[PDB]
């Protein structure tokens, strides 16, 4: 029941963003002790979720793979209820979705066999999902969960879409545990950068694994891979950017009552991409992104109503 | 805080049963929709759980492997609270436990990377756990989750303990999804039978995968592997047994209001082993086992208070 709007050969009635990655089932403590509430999250899904609330008149699509069990159907229903277009979701007969459990907060997860790890199994389906997207967004988690072949399939699809005028956006989102080794991680992340117009790295993660001395070194590294607009998040600190050789800095207004940094980066990315799609200048988009993330860290959970 | 009693060189103050396998975190629907209650289950653990309630003066030990996270510590606390001796539990630094989710009932599970899959990594620790056990109990699930090397380690430990006067009990508990193929499953199950004094197969499962024509064919197959007492469960039907060439049948009194067959076999096994350890004749032990399982299928969940 998500409105997809109309189209002719040349234009679609809705601006269209596609987000590609893994959505996770999540269980978080409910009020009665020993009980947990079931919901859905996951980095790229979270960004799609914030996007659907920022621009509910637009088309926000999610591309992934899920199972055919009850939990997978619950997940599909959740996306629709969030105003997210899940029409491109692939179903993998023998598998189920990934899950994480928050304990009371500690995170445990199970995703090694998730259906989403096959999301790049069908090159045609990937290409069709991107074809008329204004922006295609993916993360280093999207890359991490795929095998060698799937990664190549995804990067080729991204590169071809980029060449037809899709704007490609990438959050490195470094999570070493999801990679076989950090050598593989850093190498593959930079392959992702090589197909992206916009990159949204977070500095402290980059500094740990790449050895970046500062946010400007981070930007330079991405710009070296051909990224046109690099926006470097850095916690409570100013956001440095680099766009076509031009550097800039955008302040991040102090937030008191920081509660939970969950989805800080995911919501930043949504606020940023929302504003870029509206045709606002990068400095303005970064300011908007920081404002949204500022509210998000003041709320509990990955999906905060703002 | 579980009482282990005392011992001298020759006897221990408590009868001692060891159960070896995987305990699972489980989430089942709570009263408020969208919420689930966290508990712990898993076939061999369930049997240990019923055993601790049948003979709370005895020592009921559980041997497995868990992680070092909060969920693993919750599981360890649960065993202790159930009066189960978890002193032999091994901790695997980088892993967590397996989980299953009941949806509202459909079962989804995540166990491919669970710490319990390493429970046979330390041959010394296995041997020490069995050393003064009166009965050692394991299942085909215990075998399924181990790799080739772990399986060999477990079977050697079981065979050596059997030779020193441990009574070895085995429930084939056939779950094809946990095996690479059904050829591997049937072969390995019969290796388990080859080290067992008592086998507790369920007929309909055996008929599907082995091709057994009837419960007597099932018993014969196990007796051929050297099993001394084969007790064949068969749903609501009479229990056939075979002990040292002697056949027998024990009736299963009709149960009305069957609600949930979860742990029917696990509780049967507990009622049976409890009665064997008390020195009761096999026919009497089977009658007791059927009575307990009869109550268990009249209650919700794997762990029913009887
Ligand atoms: N301590 C903080 N105070 C205020 N804003 C923050 C804070 N941490 C993060 N943010 C906002 O969220 C954005 C993303 O920060 P980052 O730490 O990279 O996200 P994550 O924690 O998801 O990795 C920042 O640009 C900032 O706007
Ligand atoms: N429909 C039933 N009515 C009465 N007792 C039952 C029924 N199903 C199982 N039981 C009891 O539980 C025991 C185990 O049966 P089984 O079906 O092998 O367990 P499971 O369902 O766990 O495989 C039986 O011997 C019987 O005593
Ligand atoms: Cl048209
Ligand atoms: Cl002594």
The two tokens of residue A165 are 């005028």
Contacts 24+ apart (CB under 8 A), A230-234: A230/A198, A230/A199, A230/A201, A231/A198, A231/A199, A231/A200, A231/A272, A231/A282, A231/A286, A231/A289, A232/A201, A232/A202, A232/A203, A232/A206, A233/A200, A233/A201, A233/A202, A233/A203, A233/A265, A233/A268, A234/A202, A234/A203, A234/A204
Cβ contacts of A73 on chain B, cutoff 8 Å: none
- Whole-angstrom Cα distance, residue A178 to residue A222? 22
Q: Going by CA atoms, what residue is nearest to atom 10 of ligand 2? A: B235
Chain B nearest-CA residue for A106:
B70
With CB atoms and an 8 Å threshold, state whether B113 touches A108: no
Separation between Cα atoms, residue A26 and residue A100, nearest integer Å? 5
CA-nearest residue for atom 6, ligand 1, is A236
Question: Which among B85, B171, B266, B274 is annotated as catalytic?
Answer: B266
B-interface mutation test, from A30, A108, A113, most B Cβ less than 10 A away: A108
Main-chain phi, psi angles of B258, to 5 degrees: -70, 125
What H or E segment, with its residue span, contains residue B48?
helix B43-54
Closest residue by Cα to atom 3, ligand 2, is B236
Tokens of B252: 């299963």
Compute the half-sphere exposure of residue A239: CA atoms within 13 Å on the CB side of its CA: 31
How many of the other CB atoms lie within 10 Å of CB of B273? 26
Note whether B37 contacts A35, CB cutoff 8 Å.
yes
Interface contact B30-A27, CB threshold 8 A: no
Q: Which structure tokens are listed for A253?
A: 């207004």
DSSP string, B113-173: T-GGGGTTS-HHHHHHHHTT-SEEEEEHHHHHHS-HHHHHHHHHHHHHHHHHTPEEEEE--
CA–CA dist A263, A298 (Å, integer)? 11
A163 by Cβ neighbours in 10 Å (0-12 / 13-18 / 19+) ranks as exposed
* Main-chain dihedrals φ then ψ at residue B285, nearest 5 degrees: -60, -40
**Residue A50: φ, ψ to 5°:** -65, -35
- Residue B19, beta-bridge partner list: B62, B137
Please, after which residues is chain A broken with C–N above 2.5 Å?
A: 104
Per the structure block, which two tokens stand in for B282? 């096999």
CA angle at A297 for the pair A293 and A301, rounded to the nearest 5°: 110
Ligand 2 pocket check for B202: Cβ under 6 Å: yes
Atom of ligand 1 nearest to the CA of A266: 22
Torsion angles phi and psi, residue A108, rounded to 5:
-115, 145
| Distance, CA of B285 to CA of B276 (rounded, Å) | 6
Alpha carbons B209 and B203: distance in angstroms, whole number: 10
Q: How far is CA B62 from the centre of its chain?
A: 10
Cα A85 to chain centroid distance, Å, stands at 15
Say whether A266 is catalytic.
yes
Coil/strand/helix, residue B52: helix
Q: Which residues face A19 on adjacent strands?
A: A62, A137
Ligand 2 contacts CB of residue B268 (under 6 A): yes
Q: Are the C-beta atoms of B51 and B274 separated by less than 8 Å?
A: yes
Which residue in chain A has the smallest CA separation from B29?
A: A35
The token duo for A236 is: 């409570």
CA atoms within 13 A of residue B219's CA, in its CB half-sphere: 21
Candidate from B36, B96, B106 with C-beta closest to A36: B36
Please provide residue A119's backbone torsions phi and psi, each rounded to the nearest 5 degrees. Answer: -65, -15
Q: List the beta bridge partners of residue A111.
A: none
- Give the residue whose CA is nearest to atom 24 of ligand 2: B235
Q: Which residues pair with B60 in a beta bridge?
A: B17
How many Å apart are CA A13 and CA A11, to the nearest integer? 7
| A232 CA → ligand 1 middle, Å | 11
Breaks (C-N over 2.5 A) in chain B follow: 104
8 A C-beta contact, residue A197 and residue A134:
no
Q: How far, in Å, is the centroid of ligand 4 from the Cα of B158?
A: 26
Ligand nearest to the CA of B302: 2
In whole angstroms, how large is the CA radius of gyration of chain B?
18
Tell me the C-alpha to C-alpha distance, in Å, between residue A30 and each of A124, A193, B118: 42, 39, 32
The verdict on the CB of residue B172 being under 6 Å from ligand 2 is no
Work out which ligand 1 atom sits closest to the CA atom of A294: 5
Cα A3 to ligand 3 centroid, rounded to whole Å: 18
The minimum CA-CA distance between A53 and chain B, rounded to whole Å, is 22
CA distances from B29 to A34, A35, A40, A48, B150 (A): 12, 9, 17, 28, 35
Residue to mutate, A265, A285, A295, ligand 1, most ligand atoms under 8 Å from C-beta = A265
Please report residues of A whose CB lies closer than 8 A to that of B36: 27, 35-38
Q: B137: exposed, middle or buried (C-beta count within 10 Å: 0-12, 13-18, 19+)?
A: buried
How far from the centroid of its chain's Cα atoms is residue A206's Cα? 17
A172 is written with which tokens?
């490195």
Q: Which residues, including other chains, have CB under 8 Å from residue B40's CB and lie 6 or more apart? A: B23, B24, B25, B26, B74, B75, B78, B79
Cα B53 vs. chain centroid, distance in angstroms? Answer: 15
Cβ–Cβ gap B108/A70 under 8 Å = yes
Q: Give the separation between CA B230 and CA B232, rounded to whole angstroms.
A: 6
Please compute, for residue A195, the number of CA atoms within 13 A of its CA located in the half-sphere on the CB side: 29
Calculate how far, in angstroms, residue B239's C-alpha sits from the geometric centre of ligand 2.
10
Tell me the C-alpha distance between A84 and A46, whole Å. 11
- CA-based nearest distance A119→chain B, Å: 19
Residue of B nearest to A37 (CA): B35
In SS3 terms, A243-256 reads as ECCEEEEECCCCCC
Interchain proximity A30–B27, CB inside 8 Å: no
Domain count, chain B: 1
Expressed as residue numbers, the domain containing A70 is: 1-306
DSSP B179: S
Helix pair B264-277, B43-54: axis angle to 10 deg: 40
Method used experimentally? X-ray
B272 lines ligand 2 (CB under 6 A): no
- Residues A53, A290, A24, B67, Cα dihedral to 10°: -150
Q: List the beta bridge partners of residue A241.
A: A231, A248
Tokens coding B28: 């089942």
Resolution of the structure in the document, Å? 2.0
CB-based contacts of B42, cutoff 8 Å, min separation 6:
B21, B22, B23, B24, B98, B141
β-pairing, B24-29 vs B35-41, is antiparallel
**A interface test, pick of B26, B29, B34, B75 with most A CB neighbours within 10 Å:** B34
State the burial class of residue A1 (Cβ atoms within 10 Å of its Cβ: 0-12, 13-18, 19+).
Answer: exposed
C-beta atoms surrounding B77 within 10 Å? 12
Q: Strand B239-243 to strand B229-232: parallel, antiparallel, or no bridges (unpaired)?
A: antiparallel
Q: Which long-range contacts (CB under 8 A, 24 or more apart) does B271-276 make?
A: B271/B50, B271/B54, B272/B200, B272/B231, B273/B17, B273/B47, B273/B51, B273/B135, B273/B137, B273/B169, B273/B198, B274/B51, B274/B54, B274/B55, B276/B135, B276/B167, B276/B198
Distances B122 to A33, A168, B17, B188, B280 between C-alpha atoms, Å: 36, 50, 20, 20, 35
Segment (H or E) for B66: strand B65-66
Q: Which residue is listed with tokens 């009482």?
A: B3
A106/B69 touch (CB, cutoff 8 Å), yes or no: yes
What's the rounded Cα separation, in Å, for the pair B21 and B178?
Answer: 14
Instruction: Please tell me which of the candidates B27, B108, B113 has its beta carbon nearest to residue A36.
Output: B27
Cβ < 5 A residues, ion ligand 3: A 8
CA–CA min distance A115, chain B (Å): 12
The Cα A49–Cα A61 span in angstroms is: 10
SS3 sequence of A115-154 = HHHHCCCCHHHHHHHHCCCCEEEEEHHHHHHCCHHHHHHH
Domain CATH code at residue A279: 3.40.1190.20
- Residue B182, token pair as written in the block: 């059904």
The CA distance from A116 to the nearest CA of chain B, in Å, is 14
DSSP per-residue codes, chain A: ------B-SS-BSS-EEEEES--EEEEEE-SSTTEEEEEEE-HHHHHHHHHHHH-TTSEEEEE-EE-SSHHHHHHHHHHHHTT-B-TT-EE-TT---EEEEEE--EEEEE-TT-GGGGTTS-HHHHHHHHTT-SEEEEEHHHHHHS-HHHHHHHHHHHHHHHHHTPEEEEE----GGGSS-HHHHHHHHHHHHTT-SEE--BHHHHHHHT--SSHHHHHHHHHHTT-SEEEEB-TTSPEEEEETTEEEEE-----SS----TTHHHHHHHHHHHHHHTT--HHHHHHHHHHHHHHHTTSSSSS---
Starting from the edge strand earliest in sequence, which strands make up the sheet with B59-63, in order?
Answer: B59-63, B16-20, B135-139, B167-171, B198-199, B229-232, B239-243, B246-250
B103 interaction partners in chain A (CB closer than 8 Å): 69-71, 74
Contacts of B180 by beta carbon, 8 Å cutoff, 6+ apart: none
Give backbone dihedrals phi and psi of A98, rounded to 5 degrees, phi first.
Answer: -80, 160
Give the span between the Cα atoms of B73 and B4, in whole angstroms. Answer: 20
């Amino acid at each position: 029941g998500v409105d997809l709007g109309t189209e002719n050969l040349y234009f679609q009635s809705m601006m269209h963003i596609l987000s590609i990655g893994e959505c996770m089932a999540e269980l978080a403590p409910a009020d009665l002790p020993g009980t947990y509430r079931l919901g859905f999250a996951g980095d790229t899904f979270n960004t799609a979720w914030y996007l659907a609330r920022l621009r509910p008149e637009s088309r926000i699509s999610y591309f992934s793979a899920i199972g055919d069990d009850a939990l997978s159907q619950q997940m599909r229903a959740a996306m629709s209820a969030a105003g997210i277009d899940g029409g491109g979701l692939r179903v993998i007969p023998g598998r189920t979705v990934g899950l994480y459990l928050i304990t009371l907060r500690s995170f445990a997860y199970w995703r090694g066999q998730s259906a989403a790890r096959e999301l790049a199994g069908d090159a045609d389906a990937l290409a069709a999902a991107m074809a008329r997207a204004d922006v295609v967004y993916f993360s280093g988690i999207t890359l991490a969960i795929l095998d060698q072949c799937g990664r190549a399939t995804l990067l080729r699809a991204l590169a071809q879409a980029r060449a037809t005028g899709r704007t490609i956006a990438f959050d490195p989102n470094l999570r070493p545990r999801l990679w076989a080794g950090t050598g593989e991680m850093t190498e593959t992340i930079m392959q992702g950068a090589a197909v992206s117009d916009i990159a949204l790295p977070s500095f402290e993660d980059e500094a740990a694994w790449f050895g970046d001395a500062g946010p400007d070194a981070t930007a330079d590294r991405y710009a070296r891979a051909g990224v046109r607009s690099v926006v470097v998040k850095n916690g409570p600190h100013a956001v440095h950017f680099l766009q076509d050789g031009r550097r800039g800095r955008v302040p991040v207004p102090p937030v008191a009552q920081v509660v939970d940094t969950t989805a800080a980066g995911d919501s930043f990315n949504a606020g940023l991409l929302d504003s870029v799609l509206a045709g606002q200048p990068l400095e303005t988009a970064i300011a908007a992104a920081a404002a949204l993330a500022g509210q998000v860290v003041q709320g509990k959970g990955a999906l905060v109503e703002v």
